[PDB]
Amino acid sequence: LGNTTSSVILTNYMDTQYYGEIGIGTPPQTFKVVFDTGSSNVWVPSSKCSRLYTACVYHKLFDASDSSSYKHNGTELTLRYSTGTVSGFLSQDIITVGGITVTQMFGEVTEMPALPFMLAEFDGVVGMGFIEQAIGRVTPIFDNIISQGVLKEDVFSFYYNRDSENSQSLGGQIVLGGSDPQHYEGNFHYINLIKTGVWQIQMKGVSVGSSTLLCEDGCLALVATGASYISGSTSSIEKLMEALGAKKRLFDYVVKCNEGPTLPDISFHLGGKEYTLTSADYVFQESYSSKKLCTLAIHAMDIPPPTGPTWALGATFIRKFYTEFDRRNNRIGFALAR
Amino acid sequence: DRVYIHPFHLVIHNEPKDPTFIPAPIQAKTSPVDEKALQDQLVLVAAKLDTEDKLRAAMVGMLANFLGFRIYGMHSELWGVVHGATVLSPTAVFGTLASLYLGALDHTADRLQAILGVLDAHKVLSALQAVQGLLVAQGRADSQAQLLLSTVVGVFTAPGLHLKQPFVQGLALYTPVVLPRSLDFTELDVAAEKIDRFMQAVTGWKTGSSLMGASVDSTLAFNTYVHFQGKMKGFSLLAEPQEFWVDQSTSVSVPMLSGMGTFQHWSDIQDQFSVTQVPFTESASLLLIQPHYASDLDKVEGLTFQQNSLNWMKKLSPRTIHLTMPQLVLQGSYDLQDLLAQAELPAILHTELNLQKLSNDRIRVGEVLNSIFFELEADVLEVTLNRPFLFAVYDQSATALHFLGRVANPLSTAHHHHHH
Ligand SMILES: *[C@@H]1O[C@H](CO)[C@@H](O[C@@H]2O[C@H](CO)[C@@H](O[C@@H]3O[C@H](CO)[C@@H](O)[C@H](O[C@H]4O[C@H](CO)[C@@H](O)[C@H](O)[C@@H]4O[C@@H]4O[C@H](CO)[C@@H](O)[C@H](O)[C@H]4NC(C)=O)[C@@H]3O)[C@H](O)[C@H]2NC(C)=O)[C@H](O)[C@H]1NC(C)=O
Ligand SMILES: *[C@@H]1O[C@H](CO[C@@H]2O[C@@H](C)[C@@H](O)[C@@H](O)[C@@H]2O)[C@@H](O[C@@H]2O[C@H](CO)[C@@H](O)[C@H](O)[C@H]2NC(C)=O)[C@H](O)[C@H]1NC(C)=O
């Protein structure tokens, strides 16, 4: 009965923030949002957010009073990240994501720390994960979209473009209901999720060159579209960066820009197949000078249990491999992006 | 290259008594502030920083930038350029509110905590000292001091107001030089003269208190005085001065610093402005924004500082440039209390405030003065700053804006200490 797919065009900011637009309310109030498979909550800044919070003042605010479809809830909501925490209250309203209108519970955020959100081009987050991950056990937006039964398939897919490879053209694309064969070549290699409730799969090993340096006895791999870099445990990333000859410069891991192009391939062993990134895929080659330091698109994030410890495959991975998230068969499909 | 690009990770973790004292009368004899000794003190702080300390320093650097751009925007909106120049210090403004936070409890603490954008005042103030250390420690391989940054904090209190010692000792974590003095507020114009006289004695800087336009019940002034001296690498004082065009009908002959070499540059054709980076040291530089047409300055400020971002120095690229600009000697001040009170904010430093860790006695804030003494000194595409421009002082090592500036008129004048 349902035969519709929907395409959301994304803006690529510095190969770190891939964001699209959603409407909330009647009439729609538009917000720039990152679509994260690593989380399950929808939240945007609130009009009720104090002007003291710089991060609220320099982003779009949701005014509930200007929405004729707004329904009050007011249940407190706290979303805890690595460094900072955003908090607010739940509200219900009609959200327009793609061309699909859906009644959705989301967070009106009234407290935003300057760090890291003053570096965010996006206003809010759309969680594309499972209700098991949703704080306050709030029904995720993609569950409520499946309930409508309008989608061709209960799947969504991600294309992220390179910022340098293309200039003044498509930053990225989310498809709800299928995958766009214009942005991937060949067929999808599908890998079953370990368990429903997380976009997480088994990883057999992580190879630097031919040798398998890390994840020798097996480990976990969360596919997080909202994560800028590939992340691993502090333990794993310190070993990886030792092997690459990369040094810590303030917050970044860097190598000399001239040594960047000779850095070895990094391979992630997923579903009995090698997913390889060359130095061109995980180094930001701003220069090729022997005096300048170039940043690696890889960092340490110690994700707590029960989801972690785990690797997170972010935009660095997805830029290489077009990714299809299949809720029907609880599996992830990877194919070469073009 | 010089700007931090944050990698986002949106996976949800889901995890008896205080000694007090009446400060010494302001009239009492105090020895001048030793600026050279204060620099040496900061350089040692820098040399003893571990890599975790440098990370915490870089974080408060970024926090200070965000608040600094915001409060610069408030100044620009509410007052604009007051008689030639506006100079604001993101780090000092952040330090002032972090210093008041140390003394604050309950609603006042919560509000200050929110606007700073981050609980432990001691750690924040220590990090902010590290930021200043990381700046002045640069260029100390040679005997010449390319960078000097002196901060003096005046804490002027009415009779019967006892400062708590832990508060005063706490401020030392950020600013070693803290001068608490008892001062009569019954005549506000006489009170302002006495502060300006005392600050002239101990520093030798031209200062102007705003305390005339304060509450008659005022018991506390919390004034921050900053002196920056920056020697630009490969620049000399031209013997002959050149015309600076304030407008189409007005010019002033001023001494010009001239230097030629390889400076990072970018001419933005769409937004219509040129950026130039003149280094002081390895990591610390002077940024110079120049509108392509002199009438667009407000528009250019709108697309740079007012965006509250460093994206306008992202596209910088090396270039062979001959840079001529005025030898700046700017002495000005504004009341932070008054700025915040007239801006689009809830009340922080109102009559109903709680600074009970500062004193148990009645606190009524007369002014929170931020006073800056800014000096640029000496050691093909011609970039000539002979028309109004914006500037900033940026340190890569702490991702820290030390100063934001707008120069409509490069002349020194006492009317930079005028308060609305
Ligand atoms: C994000 O983080 C928040 C905050 O930390 C989490 O919220 C917490 O979630 C906990 C669940 O893991 C909540 O803990 C429960 O609190 C209940 C009281 O309010 C209590 O009833 C529960 O106790 C039972 O379960 C425990 C297992 O975790 C057992 O150890 C315990 O013995 C109890 O077991 C039951 O016992 C009765 C009678 O004795 C039997 O009849 C039942 O059959 C038993 N059941 C089971 C399964 O054994 C438990 O302590 C906690 O309240 C809550 N905290 C707050 C402040 O709300 C979120 O979960 C987390 N979210 C995500 C997505 O990570
Ligand atoms: C705020 O909403 C929650 C969730 O409400 C449910 O889901 C919404 C999307 C909407 O469809 C509602 O009609 C649903 O009821 C409320 O939590 C529920 O509380 C009831 C108790 O009356 C309970 O039966 C449900 O199991 C709860 N659901 C969850 C997920 O906890 C909550 O009561 C609302 N709060 C207010 C103040 O209105």
Side-chain angles (χ1 to χ4, degrees), chain A residues 1-136 138-161 163-164 166-167 169-212 214-338, chain B residues 1-16 18-26 28 30-35 37-55 57-143 145-247 249-269 271-298 300-313 315-420:
Chain A
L1 203 296
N3 62 28
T4 58
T5 75
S6 191
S7 298
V8 185
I9 293 182
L10 306 179
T11 300
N12 175 352
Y13 176 82
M14 306 301 295
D15 280 325
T16 53
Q17 302 178 38
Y18 296 84
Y19 63 85
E21 182 185 308
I22 64 165
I24 315 179
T26 317
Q29 302 174 37
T30 71
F31 299 87
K32 297 158 170 75
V33 294
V34 164
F35 299 87
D36 186 27
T37 52
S39 59
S40 308
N41 286 92
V42 182
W43 71 260
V44 296
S46 184
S47 68
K48 308 212 209 316
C49 184
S50 174
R51 289 168 297 167
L52 290 172
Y53 296 106
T54 307
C56 283
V57 176
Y58 287 97
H59 288 99
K60 174 71 68 57
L61 306 181
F62 178 70
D63 201 355
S65 67
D66 297 343
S67 177
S68 59
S69 48
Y70 161 80
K71 180 166 157 47
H72 170 89
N73 185 277
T75 303
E76 280 182 30
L77 179 77
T78 299
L79 309 175
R80 305 169 215 272
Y81 300 105
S82 68
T83 61
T85 293
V86 317
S87 69
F89 59 86
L90 295 178
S91 293
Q92 184 189 99
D93 210 330
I94 297 160
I95 296 187
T96 309
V97 53
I100 303 183
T101 57
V102 52
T103 301
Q104 185 59 31
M105 273 285 180
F106 65 98
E108 280 195 59
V109 166
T110 59
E111 310 198 336
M112 258 194 291
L115 215 51
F117 286 106
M118 275 305 300
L119 303 171
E121 294 300 319
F122 62 87
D123 302 296
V125 178
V126 169
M128 298 295 282
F130 297 78
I131 191 165
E132 285 87 339
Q133 293 164 286
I135 306 299
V138 175
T139 306
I141 195 167
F142 197 68
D143 288 28
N144 285 322
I145 288 168
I146 287 165
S147 289
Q148 291 186 350
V150 299
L151 288 184
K152 182 195 280 270
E153 299 146 288
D154 294 354
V155 314
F156 60 87
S157 69
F158 275 75
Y159 170 64
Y160 288 172
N161 195 16
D163 190 53
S164 61
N166 276 229
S167 190
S169 85
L170 187 72
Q173 191 184 252
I174 299 165
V175 179
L176 305 174
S179 293
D180 194 339
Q182 176 165 358
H183 291 299
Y184 69 92
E185 72 186 38
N187 299 68
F188 286 109
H189 169 220
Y190 288 97
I191 310 171
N192 293 346
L193 300 178
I194 295 165
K195 189 176 63 179
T196 200
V198 197
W199 290 116
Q200 194 175 46
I201 57 171
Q202 292 211 239
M203 191 151 64
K204 187 216 175 66
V206 178
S207 299
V208 181
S210 68
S211 316
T212 303
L214 300 162
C215 182
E216 304 204 65
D217 304 320
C219 64
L220 306 175
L222 178 68
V223 183
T225 55
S228 300
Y229 292 175
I230 286 160
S231 85
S233 61
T234 305
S235 184
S236 297
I237 293 299
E238 276 174 1
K239 271 198 68 167
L240 179 53
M241 294 297 173
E242 187 66 43
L244 293 170
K247 275 286 152 69
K248 198 77 190 292
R249 195 280 312 282
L250 263 181
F251 304 103
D252 301 306
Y253 273 107
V254 298
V255 294
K256 298 208 268 279
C257 291
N258 77 302
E259 282 167 16
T262 43
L263 288 176
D265 288 3
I266 297 168
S267 284
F268 305 90
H269 294 254
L270 303 166
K273 201 177 286 282
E274 265 197 332
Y275 285 86
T276 301
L277 305 185
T278 74
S279 69
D281 293 314
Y282 68 82
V283 184
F284 295 124
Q285 295 288 170
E286 294 300 330
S287 180
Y288 294 101
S289 170
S290 66
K291 299 164 193 181
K292 297 315 190 84
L293 296 166
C294 281
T295 293
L296 306 193
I298 306 167
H299 71 148
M301 189 52 57
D302 291 312
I303 301 162
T307 304
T310 188
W311 295 78
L313 306 182
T316 307
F317 188 86
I318 292 156
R319 268 196 290 279
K320 184 82 173 213
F321 303 112
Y322 190 109
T323 308
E324 173 176 290
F325 302 85
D326 185 344
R327 277 290 304 283
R328 188 92 188 188
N329 302 310
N330 289 250
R331 59 183 193 163
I332 295 164
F334 297 122
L336 258 179
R338 71 208 309 178
Chain B
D1 195 1
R2 50 269 289 96
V3 170
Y4 169 66
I5 312 300
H6 178 76
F8 275 87
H9 213 291
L10 299 172
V11 179
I12 291 168
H13 284 222
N14 194 30
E15 291 191 342
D18 281 16
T20 71
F21 71 99
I22 302 300
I26 194 170
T30 307
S31 52
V33 171
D34 195 343
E35 276 194 282
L38 178 52
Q39 298 313 291
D40 292 352
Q41 195 177 144
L42 285 171
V43 171
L44 184 59
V45 164
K48 295 166 80 85
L49 293 174
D50 64 45
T51 63
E52 200 206 328
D53 298 328
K54 291 174 182 165
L55 277 175
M59 280 195 283
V60 304
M62 285 191 290
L63 288 173
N65 295 344
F66 303 141
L67 184 53
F69 278 129
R70 196 186 172 182
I71 287 167
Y72 176 88
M74 290 175 182
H75 193 304
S76 187
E77 257 280 307
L78 294 161
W79 300 329
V81 183
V82 180
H83 292 124
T86 305
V87 189
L88 186 140
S89 169
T91 44
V93 168
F94 187 94
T96 300
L97 294 168
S99 295
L100 293 169
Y101 175 61
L102 178 64
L105 287 173
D106 302 344
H107 72 275
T108 303
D110 290 354
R111 286 184 151 101
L112 283 166
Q113 181 169 20
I115 198 163
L116 288 166
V118 67
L119 188 82
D120 201 351
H122 301 275
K123 298 280 192 173
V124 168
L125 290 162
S126 282
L128 197 61
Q129 175 171 278
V131 172
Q132 297 189 140
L134 285 164
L135 180 66
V136 304
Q138 299 177 46
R140 292 278 285 195
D142 58 78
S143 53
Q146 274 78 7
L147 293 164
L148 174 140
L149 182 60
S150 301
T151 307
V152 179
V153 174
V155 181
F156 311 104
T157 56
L161 200 159
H162 307 263
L163 284 182
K164 300 192 174 175
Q165 198 64 52
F167 173 82
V168 171
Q169 292 176 329
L171 295 186
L173 291 178
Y174 161 41
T175 47
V177 185
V178 186
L179 301 172
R181 297 293 185 272
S182 43
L183 189 261
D184 176 34
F185 286 75
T186 49
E187 282 176 289
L188 293 175
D189 61 334
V190 171
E193 285 168 19
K194 284 185 179 182
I195 290 171
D196 291 340
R197 178 166 139 93
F198 172 75
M199 290 306 311
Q200 250 286 327
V202 304
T203 73
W205 312 334
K206 296 155 175 163
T207 57
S209 176
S210 78
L211 201 56
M212 269 207 71
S215 168
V216 298
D217 299 327
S218 292
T219 59
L220 180 62
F222 194 91
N223 301 353
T224 305
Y225 305 86
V226 173
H227 174 212
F228 173 82
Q229 206 175 331
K231 296 167 202 210
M232 295 157 74
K233 205 165 183 287
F235 282 76
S236 54
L237 182 63
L238 292 179
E240 218 60 23
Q242 301 176 18
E243 298 303 325
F244 191 99
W245 290 95
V246 177
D247 53 43
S249 314
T250 314
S251 87
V252 291
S253 88
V254 298
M256 293 282 189
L257 300 173
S258 188
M260 178 155 47
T262 307
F263 305 124
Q264 302 297 126
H265 187 103
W266 179 246
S267 178
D268 186 337
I269 304 296
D271 291 359
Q272 300 190 105
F273 65 84
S274 285
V275 185
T276 309
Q277 185 177 91
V278 173
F280 297 108
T281 67
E282 194 87 320
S283 310
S285 58
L286 179 71
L287 298 169
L288 296 168
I289 307 170
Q290 184 171 35
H292 285 155
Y293 311 113
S295 49
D296 298 335
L297 184 55
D298 276 326
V300 169
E301 195 193 81
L303 297 165
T304 56
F305 295 171
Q306 202 166 311
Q307 292 300 330
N308 200 338
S309 159
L310 307 179
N311 291 350
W312 51 262
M313 63 180 302
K315 260 177 137 65
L316 284 172
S317 173
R319 190 70 175 280
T320 314
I321 286 164
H322 179 225
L323 200 296
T324 314
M325 75 172 291
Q327 169 208 278
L328 289 181
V329 183
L330 303 177
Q331 298 213 241
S333 61
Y334 63 86
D335 187 3
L336 186 63
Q337 188 194 22
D338 188 40
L339 180 50
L340 291 173
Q342 285 185 244
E344 302 304 315
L345 287 174
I348 303 163
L349 305 166
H350 64 171
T351 315
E352 310 296 74
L353 90 172
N354 186 349
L355 297 174
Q356 276 170 37
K357 274 187 297 196
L358 199 151
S359 182
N360 287 324
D361 294 80
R362 179 183 62 91
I363 296 159
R364 184 63 169 281
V365 182
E367 73 179 350
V368 181
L369 201 71
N370 284 30
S371 186
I372 289 171
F373 178 16
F374 189 87
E375 286 189 293
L376 290 180
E377 292 191 326
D379 270 11
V380 67
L381 175 54
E382 287 182 356
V383 178
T384 317
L385 300 190
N386 64 347
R387 67 197 176 197
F389 61 96
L390 312 182
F391 75 79
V393 176
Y394 184 67
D395 182 17
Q396 284 165 21
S397 65
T399 58
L401 294 165
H402 286 268
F403 300 96
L404 294 163
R406 174 162 182 171
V407 175
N409 194 320
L411 289 184
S412 303
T413 181
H415 298 114
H416 289 150
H417 295 291
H418 172 262
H419 313 280
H420 284 257

